[PDB]
Design a protein around this nucleic acid. Structure first.
Ligand SMILES: O=C1c2c(ccc(O)c2O)CN1Cc1ccc(F)c(Cl)c1
Ligand SMILES: O=C1c2c(ccc(O)c2O)CN1Cc1ccc(F)c(Cl)c1
Ligand SMILES: [Mg+2]
Ligand SMILES: [Mg+2]
Ligand SMILES: [Mg+2]
Ligand SMILES: [Mg+2]
Ligand SMILES: [Zn+2]
Ligand SMILES: [Zn+2]
Lengths: 184, 368, 368, 184
DNA sequence: TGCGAAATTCCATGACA
DNA sequence: ATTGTCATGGAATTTCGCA
DNA sequence: TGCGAAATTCCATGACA
DNA sequence: ATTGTCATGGAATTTCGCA
């Protein structure tokens, strides 16, 4: 059987609702299975429509063979199905309540949730602006298991923005008290 | 003047006046019998004025000026005096065309890596499509991989909007652009410094300098056109298609598509190349690094038989950019401070500033 | 289709499928092991569709299309089928640029006599000077002698006004002009027939065809510009000066001024040539007839290494004149009815009319 | 002494007033001494101003060495003198009451007067339009004394409009009765 | 070890307003 | 302080299939 | 019958929007 | 049914003045 490549499989999922930021409420998360490269798109809802709008942007840069998701409404609609068939993208579902991805992906998705939380404190409303810097972070993060970052696996070169001081990613004492106080 | 000419009438030899012709007086003027006929030999103190009167009739160049003078006069080395005047005629110097071509173009080295250099530029205005009139075109120097963003103006504000979205993928070392208002604003300057991006600018009015993106603009317009044949020019919805189409199109000389040079593997697009199906991603990335370095690079073409190349301290003139009707096409002479390369120079200009300009926007001042 | 391919799997030889490779089945499709790798060999009944899908991705030419197909397929003489499609793609044919140059220019014989042929044309709009915006330029073909008339529009009415005044001097056999509105009006037609003048027209959008006057327009603008350096562009009062100036200026190659070729003697202008002071007018006119016939005439330049020349019944396409944004630069293919000369042709056009056009406004339809 | 050439001498004179035609009242007449070539310019008055305006047109085609005239006011003004000096045109006057030209010129001027009269009958008001055809006539008229027409002497070639039926130039019976009746 | 035909490469032309 | 580029389709050249 | 310098001719370049 | 042209100023070439 053939080795795993980029664009083999895109794992997609929504995160939200979050506090309004420049009109937006959710984040569509795309992660490449092989490389762990991450794309993020802000949406106003978790709908087939918002998913297609966003995926249209990405699929005009590269097209996955397979998209993997939970049985979210937006992904199970026949509109979404029609969309993917139109592009010879095979769709793939984890069974309800029991979500399976891959270790690499699971861990990536975990970093994504944590890193978001870390920045939407103090400025829970200003995340829209930060989505680009978040992505660069995530994508220039060293993978313990592989010798390489997702940027390096995707493009085959070092990045002009390496994230050398790999961070706490943990809530400092002040943030705990103003996150357990922001959700008051 | 009268000293020399007196000296002459009385048969004695003067340098410049060949001895075999005889030099008489008549009507109070020194004449001479030359093969063509009898010509007046004015005193030296008169010759400047004459050359000038003749030149001024129609502001003619060397031969056409000489021919008027030769109608009445003869003296030693007439063309020298004619050329002396041409070189001093402000009006001729800034209005005439050059008749010397630029030296052969440079073929700059291809950026080594994806994201080393971007070339960016606007296309438009286009027929309004969803209230959009322009397209931001961003082209990776090394790969040719191209991003498209529809805008309402070629503004800094829209450039920043689009480039924040692009640079979520990667941050480039350098962004080269023409001197369009959008890119030369200090807001854009801040935006770039904020991200450790270096701004590189073409010399002014020289789009060849952005040739990478310029050339890609052509492909973009060409493909949009075919796609819109016999439909209303609704191009907004096709940008994404055009992007994907071109990023996945082969350059016959390279034998690669910008997508391949960017990723080393085709994505799920029609006719995807399957040749590395058995390599591991690493063996794949290793072959990509090889492919990348060994790509065809063209060389400087032969200089045309009548090119000029700039030399430090030479008198040269910059082309007036948007010359008003009936006004000169050239600025006043200026001096070459520094030869940055054989096709680019720094000059001390028409007011008193330093300017970096393309050799294509200069002519060498004639007659020294 | 399946006939040929059945025939093949069972080891028997088919023309076009070289014998040394082996042709198996897998996943229900005929494949073959080629040096580059394993490729599907689609049935002939499938190949048109494939070539089309590949071509349509970015409407690519021969090699870039081939390279997509070769990713998955192999069959005999692929490029033939590729080219077959290119030649049938309406959108590619009318949008792509030519890559074949026009054949070398004709250098038509100089009119034999003053007044044999006029070339006329308008310059402008110019900065308003006394409410005038244009200049009628009339150039005698044989002599280059030039008349200037300031007008308020490039209209028939003004053309007739000026030409009545000019033709008080002489009536010309023929007046050549571009297809500007002023000259193609039926009023102008009447005006000319009324006087036994023959109207000659350039092919459309080809000002090289009026090169005689066009070129003189350059001199006129150039001289006006120098004369107006640092003054307000008040050109009305200078037309007369410019006229006289240029009519009395030497062509270095000819060694004559248009005034001399027109009259055989200089008038009382500065630097008048005095060489025929001793001849009678008749001896003078006799020398003029000699000078006139022996003037330098240039010859056709060498064809460029990749020119094309039109051939009766060939498929060629006329350039769209003022193409809208995002629309094709070329009209649909049409046929060469008649080869008037090697640079001029008659074609049966895009609707159903006869048109006389310059080879410069055509490309040969590619792929036959 | 040197043979006679074109542009050696221009003989100028006014003719008028004539009946108004498109605003004009007079004709300035220029005839080249050597060639007998004729130029005609319509003016609103016989003034230095109108003379300069008209001569400016002609002297932008060719410049005579000498202009010859009667001591008409317009030609004796110092404005006219200044004008000519500016162009190195020498001025030349016949003594008052005793006008001398040349035979060729005299006869030309005569033809001009007659031919005008012949056409400003029946249409005394429409001459402005006819000045061009008048000139072509005059200039393609055979000179008994020389083998050639003025067109031929000026340009050294035949003309595309030869005036083959050299005319009566005399008033036919009908015109006599309506010219001796128009001046009623 | 050499042929005829296909495949590939070369490259001038033109457009990025 | 910066610098032309590259799709295109005939022609020229090389390679291929067979001997 | 030959030299050094001037005079002439050649000609590629660019503009007629 | 029509068609490029020619001022320009360095360089290349020819001619000139003298021997
Ligand atoms: O694209 C632009 C452009 C222009 C002026 C000013 C700008 O800012 C531009 O972007 C003209 N232009 C088209 C052009 C014309 C001739 C060439 F050789 C190339 Cl490469 C490209
Ligand atoms: O003079 C005109 C003109 C044009 C369009 C339409 C007309 O009617 C014209 O008179 C363009 N043009 C200038 C021009 C451009 C390129 C050339 F090669 C030459 Cl020779 C002359
Ligand atoms: Mg631009
Ligand atoms: Mg541009
Ligand atoms: Mg015109
Ligand atoms: Mg024109
Ligand atoms: Zn000048
Ligand atoms: Zn096509």
């Amino acid at each position: 059987d053939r080795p795993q490549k980029p664009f083999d499989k895109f794992f997609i999922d929504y995160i939200g609702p979050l506090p309004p930021s420049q009109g937006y409420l959710y984040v569509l998360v795309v992660v490449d299975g092989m490389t762990g490269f991450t794309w993020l798109y802000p949406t106003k809802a978790p709908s087939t429509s918002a998913t297609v709008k966003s995926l249209n942007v990405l699929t005009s840069i590269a097209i996955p063979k397979v998209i993997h998701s939970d049985q979210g409404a937006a992904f199970t609609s026949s509109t979404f199905a029609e969309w993917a068939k139109e592009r010879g993208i095979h769709l793939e579902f984890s069974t309800p309540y029991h979500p399976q991805s891959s270790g690499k992906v699971e861990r990536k998705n975990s970093d994504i949730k944590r890193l978001l939380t870390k920045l939407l404190v103090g400025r829970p409303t200003k995340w829209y602006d930060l989505l680009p810097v978040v992505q660069l972070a995530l994508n220039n993060t060293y993978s313990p298991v592989l010798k390489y970052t997702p940027h390096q696996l995707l493009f085959g070169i070092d990045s002009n923005t390496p994230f050398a001081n790999q961070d706490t990613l943990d809530l400092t004492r002040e943030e705990e008290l103003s996150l357990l106080q922001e959700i008051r | 003047l009268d000293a020399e000419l007196d000296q002459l009438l009385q048969g004695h030899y003067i340098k410049g006046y060949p001895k075999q012709y005889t030099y008489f007086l008549e009507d109070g003027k020194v004449k001479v019998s030359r093969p063509e006929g009898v010509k007046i030999i004015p005193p030296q103190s008169d010759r400047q004025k004459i050359v000038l009167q003749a030149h001024n009739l129609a502001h003619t160049g060397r031969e056409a000026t000489l021919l008027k003078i030769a109608n009445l006069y003869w003296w030693p080395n007439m063309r020298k005096d004619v050329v002396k005047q041409l070189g001093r005629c402000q009006q001729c110097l800034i209005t005439n065309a050059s008749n010397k071509a630029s030296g052969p173009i440079l073929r700059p080295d291809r950026p080594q890596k994806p994201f080393d250099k971007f070339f960016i530029d606007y296309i438009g205005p286009l027929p309004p499509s969803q209230g959009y009139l322009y397209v931001l075109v961003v082209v990776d120097g090394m790969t040719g991989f191209t991003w498209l963003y529809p805008t309402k103006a070629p503004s800094t504000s829209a450039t920043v909007k689009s480039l924040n979205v692009l640079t979520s993928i990667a941050i480039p070392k350098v962004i080269h652009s023409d001197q369009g208002a959008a890119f030369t604003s200090s807001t854009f300057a801040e935006w770039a410094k904020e991200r450790g991006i270096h701004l590189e600018f073409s010399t002014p009015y020289h789009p060849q300098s952005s040739g990478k993106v310029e050339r890609k603009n052509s492909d973009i317009k060409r493909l949009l056109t075919k796609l819109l044949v016999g439909r209303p020019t609704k191009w907004y919805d096709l940008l994404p298609v055009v992007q994907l189409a071109l990023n996945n199109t082969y350059s016959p000389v390279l034998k690669y598509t910008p997508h391949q040079l960017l990723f080393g593997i085709d994505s799920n697009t029609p006719f995807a190349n399957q040749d590395t199906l058995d390599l591991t991603r690493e063996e794949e990335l290793s072959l990509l690094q090889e492919i990348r370095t060994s790509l065809y690079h063209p060389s400087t073409p032969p200089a045309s038989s009548r090119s000029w190349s700039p030399v430090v301290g030479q008198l040269v003139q910059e082309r007036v950019a948007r010359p008003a009707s009936l006004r000169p096409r050239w600025h006043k002479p200026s001096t070459v401070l520094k030869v940055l390369n054989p096709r680019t120079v720094v000059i001390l200009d028409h007011l008193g500033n330093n300017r970096t300009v393309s050799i294509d926007n200069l002519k060498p001042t004639s007659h020294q």
